[PDB]
Amino acid sequence: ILQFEDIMTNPFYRERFGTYMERIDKRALVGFWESAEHLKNANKSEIPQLVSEMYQNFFVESKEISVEKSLYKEIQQCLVGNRGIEVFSKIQADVSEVLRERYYPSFLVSDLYEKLMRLEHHH
Numbered sequence: 001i002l003q004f005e006d007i008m009t010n011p012f013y014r015e016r017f018g019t020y021m022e023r024i025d026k027r028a029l030v031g032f033w034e035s036a037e038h039l040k041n042a043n044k045s046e047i048p049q050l051v052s053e054m055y056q057n058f059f060v061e062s063k064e065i066s067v068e069k070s071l072y073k074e075i076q077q078c079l080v081g082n083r084g085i086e087v088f089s090k091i092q093a094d095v096s097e098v099l100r101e102r103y104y105p106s107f108l109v110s111d112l113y114e115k116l117m118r119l120e121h122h123h
Contacts, residue, residue: 001108002108002113002116002123004099004100004104007104007107008033008096008099011034013116014030014033014034016112016113016116017030017099017103017104017107017112018030018031019112020103020107020110020112020113021099021103025064026064026103028057028058028062028064028065029064029065029095029098029099029103030099031057031058031062032054032057032058032064032065032091032092032095033092033095033096033099035050035053035054035057035058036054036088036089036091036092036095037092038050039051039054039085039088039089040085040088040089040092047085048081051078051079051085051088052079054088055075055079059072059075065091065095067091067094071087071090071091074087075087075088
């Protein structure tokens with residue numbers, strides 16, 4: 001049994017979990033997680049463009065990432081440079097808890113995961 005952290009940190013495993021989440025139109029939770037992980041690792045030169053793209057991908061084009069008004073106001077401040085990017089790491093932790101508690105256990109009993117374990121028989 002792959003641990004939740006093992007699925008999220010291997011990019012191939014995480015993409016297959018994205019495929020599983022696309023079946024209920026919730027791939028954006030996995031996409032947001034990976035964009036937030038990239039943001040916190042990125043060269044500081046990249047942050048303005050990556051924050052703009054984050055808002056486009058996960059708050060404009062998708063409304064799957066549901067946040068309390070206080071967090072959304074912190075994002076609205078971050079768009080115009082009046083806050084840092086830590087709000088995206090907070091929302092990442094909230095998304096991670098949803099994925100781990102609500103979706104990961106059902107992913108483990110999917111066709112997609114059964115195939116993954118045949119592909120990765122070294123486990």
